[PDB]
Amino acid sequence: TTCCPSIVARSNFNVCRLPGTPEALCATYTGCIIIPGATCPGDYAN
């Protein structure tokens, strides 16, 4: 899971992901954490 800290950062993450490709670059570019865990930390849950 693509765990983002704010709703804005997740929406920005989804704009990064409009081409439908660079999930890891969407992480670095929007300060989100892609974690092997099936769900998101309390502080990274959008």
Conformation bin of residue 21: beta by default, left when phi > 0, alpha when psi is -120 to 50: alpha
Q: Using DSSP bridges, classify how beta strands 2-3 and 33-34 pair: parallel, antiparallel or unpaired.
A: antiparallel
CB 30 within 8 A of CB 4: yes
Burial of 30 (0-12, 13-18, 19+ CB in 10 A): buried
Length of the chain: 46
- Determination technique for this entry: NMR
CATH of the domain at 11: 3.30.1350.10
CB 27 within 8 A of CB 34: yes
Domains contained in the chain, number:
1
Which structural domain range is residue 33 located in? 1-46
